[PDB]
Amino acid sequence: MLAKDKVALLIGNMNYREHPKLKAPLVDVYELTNLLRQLDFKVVSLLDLTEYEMRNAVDEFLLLLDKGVYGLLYYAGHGYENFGNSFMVPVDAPNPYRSENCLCVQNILKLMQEKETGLNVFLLDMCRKTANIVFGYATCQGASGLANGIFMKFLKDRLLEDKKITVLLDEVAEDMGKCHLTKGKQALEIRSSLSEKRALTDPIQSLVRNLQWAKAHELPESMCLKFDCGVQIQLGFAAEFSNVMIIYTSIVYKPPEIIMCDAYVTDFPLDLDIDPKDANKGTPEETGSYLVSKDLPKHCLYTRLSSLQKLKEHLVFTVCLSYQYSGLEDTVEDKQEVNVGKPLIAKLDMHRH
Amino acid sequence: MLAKDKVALLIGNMNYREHPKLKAPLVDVYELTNLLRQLDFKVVSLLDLTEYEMRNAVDEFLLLLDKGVYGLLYYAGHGYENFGNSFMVPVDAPNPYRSENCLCVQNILKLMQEKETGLNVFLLDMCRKTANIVFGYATCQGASGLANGIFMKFLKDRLLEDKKITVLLDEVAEDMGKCHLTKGKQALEIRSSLSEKRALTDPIQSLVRNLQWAKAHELPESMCLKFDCGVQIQLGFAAEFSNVMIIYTSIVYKPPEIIMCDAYVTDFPLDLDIDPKDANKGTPEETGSYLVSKDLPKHCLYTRLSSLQKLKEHLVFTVCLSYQYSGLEDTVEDKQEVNVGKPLIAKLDMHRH
Ligand SMILES: CSc1ccc2c(c1)N(CC[C@@H]1CCCCN1C)c1ccccc1S2
Numbered sequence: 001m002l003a004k005d006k007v008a009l010l011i012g013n014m015n016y017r018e019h020p021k022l023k024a025p026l027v028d029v030y031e032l033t034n035l036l037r038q039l040d041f042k043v044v045s046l047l048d049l050t051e052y053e054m055r056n057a058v059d060e061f062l063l064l065l066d067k068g069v070y071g072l073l074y075y076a077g078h079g080y081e082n083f084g085n086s087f088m089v090p091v092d093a094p095n096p097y098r099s100e101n102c103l104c105v106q107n108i109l110k111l112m113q114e115k116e117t118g119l120n121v122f123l124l125d126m127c128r129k130t131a132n133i134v135f136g137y138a139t140c141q142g143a144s145g146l147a148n149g150i151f152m153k154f155l156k157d158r159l160l161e162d163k164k165i166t167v168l169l170d171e172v173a174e175d176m177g178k179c180h181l182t183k184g185k186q187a188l189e190i191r192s193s194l195s196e197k198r199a200l201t202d203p204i205q206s207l208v209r210n211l212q213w214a215k216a217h218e219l220p221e222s223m224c225l226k227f228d229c230g231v232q233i234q235l236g237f238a239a240e241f242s243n244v245m246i247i248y249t250s251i252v253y254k255p256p257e258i259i260m261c262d263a264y265v266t267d268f269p270l271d272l273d274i275d276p277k278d279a280n281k282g283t284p285e286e287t288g289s290y291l292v293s294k295d296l297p298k299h300c301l302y303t304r305l306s307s308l309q310k311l312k313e314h315l316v317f318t319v320c321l322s323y324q325y326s327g328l329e330d331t332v333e334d335k336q337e338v339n340v341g342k343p344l345i346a347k348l349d350m351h352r353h
Numbered sequence: 354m355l356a357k358d359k360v361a362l363l364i365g366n367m368n369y370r371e372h373p374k375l376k377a378p379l380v381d382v383y384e385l386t387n388l389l390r391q392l393d394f395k396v397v398s399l400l401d402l403t404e405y406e407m408r409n410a411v412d413e414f415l416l417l418l419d420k421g422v423y424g425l426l427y428y429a430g431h432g433y434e435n436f437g438n439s440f441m442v443p444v445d446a447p448n449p450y451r452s453e454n455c456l457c458v459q460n461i462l463k464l465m466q467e468k469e470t471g472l473n474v475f476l477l478d479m480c481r482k483t484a485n486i487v488f489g490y491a492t493c494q495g496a497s498g499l500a501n502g503i504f505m506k507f508l509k510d511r512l513l514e515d516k517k518i519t520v521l522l523d524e525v526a527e528d529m530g531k532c533h534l535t536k537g538k539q540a541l542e543i544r545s546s547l548s549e550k551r552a553l554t555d556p557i558q559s560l561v562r563n564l565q566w567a568k569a570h571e572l573p574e575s576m577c578l579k580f581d582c583g584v585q586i587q588l589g590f591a592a593e594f595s596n597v598m599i600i601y602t603s604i605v606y607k608p609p610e611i612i613m614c615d616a617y618v619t620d621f622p623l624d625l626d627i628d629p630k631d632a633n634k635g636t637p638e639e640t641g642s643y644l645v646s647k648d649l650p651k652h653c654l655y656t657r658l659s660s661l662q663k664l665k666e667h668l669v670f671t672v673c674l675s676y677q678y679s680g681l682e683d684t685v686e687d688k689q690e691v692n693v694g695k696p697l698i699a700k701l702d703m704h705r706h
Pocket residue numbers: 007008009042043044056057058060061063064209210212213216348
């Protein structure tokens with residue numbers, strides 16, 4: 001009934017290059033993260049991961065699976081099923097699906113079986129297809145303002161109960177059976193080898209791994225930049241996921257001369273695919289972050305750094321003023337370079353194995 | 354919470370020609386049969402089945418798996434595991450194991466998935482290796498007077514509870530985890546796709562299949578044979594399994610002249626491998642039947658017809674007197690032929706598909 005440690009990996013794929021884009025992963029990952037954080041889990045929550053990235057993530061999660069620890073692996077995205085095998089489809093995989101570009105569940109399972117963990121939860125919320133392993137395999141992605149998936153809708157309600165994981169997983173499967181969409185088709189399949197009364201609400205009693213997590217989720221301190229013209233800018237930061245950071249720009253001081261100005265953030269490194277057409281927005285929802293206008297200050301300009309695991313070099317970006325007073329007809333610009341270092345998951349380079 | 358019908362198939366392999374003989378199947382099958390009979394299940398309980406027999410049994414069980422019925426399939430014997438596949442080993446299979454001679458679990462499963470049954474329980478007690486399918490896969494055969502297997506030891510206690518099958522299967526897995534032999538190794542693995550509150554204790558509310566079961570388990574009426582010398586013999590019958598019948602011979606009348614006699618049963622058809630060295634025993638335990646001396650009359654001679662599914666032709670056997678009085682020095686014999694018809698499972702010929 002006790003855990004040596006509690007570590008979880010959460011993968012959500014929402015933006016496919018060559019397959020249909022998915023809406024549910026973002027909320028399910030965010031919501032399940034904070035819920036496991038409540039259960040004292042050192043969670044890594046990653047969005048829109050490629051083949052090589054996914055592979056590196058899992059291997060790194062598997063390394064933490066020492067004797068008596070509690071592992072949780074949640075994947076929400078596209079799935080594939082060929083010759084009784086199932087695969088987790090990454091964002092880079094081309095259409096049609098091919099196994100060489102995907103992650104075989106059966107293999108992940110084979111590696112998990114070679115473990116001495118007191119509990120290991122393998123959750124899959126797939127679309128369009130003793131180690132004490134508790135395998136939960138859902139097949140429904142037909143999901144307020146924001147979309148929550150059918151599996152998570154029920155998983156969240158029961159996740160905080162002090163009952164055996166298999167008992168909750170069985171109740172969530174029946175809960176789905178009461179719902180109209182999930183009664184028609186049997187989306188949930190459970191596979192257990194759990195010999196003891198192990199729950200997700202179980203205390204821990206080696207805390208060096210807690211310090212390694214803190215190091216992996218360090219957000220840059222709020223910075224202020226003074227410009228030649230006099231205007232002083234505020235640079236704020238917020239964490240959304242392990243690989244997703246929101247950047248905000250506000251104006252602290254404006255002299256009576258300046259009638260219109262706003263600091264824009266640009267020239268982010270090439271490795272992260274951020275298109276200027278989706279940055280420096282009016283509200284943070286426009287990006288769009290799970291983070292709502294209320295938890296971030298109003299009158300700012302927002303930019304979301306979606307892919308941080310691609311940060312090979314220290315974060316360097318330029319900020320522009322774009323200030324014009326009605327007296328003069330032409331718009332003027334002044335710019336300066338900022339170094340934010342290696343934020344969040346970017347600290348540990350995703351490269352390589 | 355209701356069943357269209359409740360049908361179960363129980364296979365136990367206890368006497369291997371080319372692999373180690375097993376002791377537990379006999380009690381587990383007998384004990385689980387009567388327990389499911391209590392739960393209003395039309396059970397067929399078969400012992401020591403070959404390749405072709407096993408294959409025919411399963412197919413015939415699968416044909417009963419119509420919409421909303423409750424199926425239960427219990428196999429206790431040797432198992433085999435090659436390339437992630439598991440196999441049920443029949444009695445005729447040679448050593449080493451070969452798949453062509455065995456029954457792939459994965460295939461049985463594939464066929465079960467093509468069903469509309471309200472519940473389908475697949476139990477396996479293997480050694481030395483929506484359809485609402487509840488797959489229970491045990492791997493421990495290191496089992497009063499008679500041996501009861503580790504899985505059954507706990508399965509029987511919980512089998513009569515009005516709780517969801519998956520909940521009981523989870524409790525039996527934990528019960529095993531409390532036991533010393535079953536805590537060391539994780540023998541039980543559960544796989545469920547059960548979306549609704551379906552239990553083995555569930556009422557039925559099409560009863561033509563009940564009449565077909567009765568027909569399949571008709572035992573021959575107790576017969577008496579009068580001999581030329583005067584001595585009258587009693588021929589009794591008892592059912593042990595669907596394919597296993599106990600035959601008993603007693604003496605009703607003996608004139609004052611006869612000082613020693615006993616009716617021996619012989620010349621049973623060749624298809625059933627009964628060796629005279631194991632027939633006409635002092636007590637029924639000597640055969641040995643699960644049936645104890647107390648439920649059958651004392652002072653009889655017992656013969657067990659182990660394999661009845663091999664009965665292609667009406668049961669014909671000869672009975673001999675073997676009577677000698679101390680006055681005369683030589684032992685005399687008189688014999689007559691008896692037709693018992695097609696008893697128990699022998700009524701429906703196991704041949705062929
Ligand atoms: C601490 S709590 C925690 C829980 C889940 C993950 C995780 C950390 N990390 C950091 C893993 C460390 C980093 C240092 C070397 C050894 N590894 C195993 C990951 C990192 C990269 C991809 C996926 C994951 S999964």
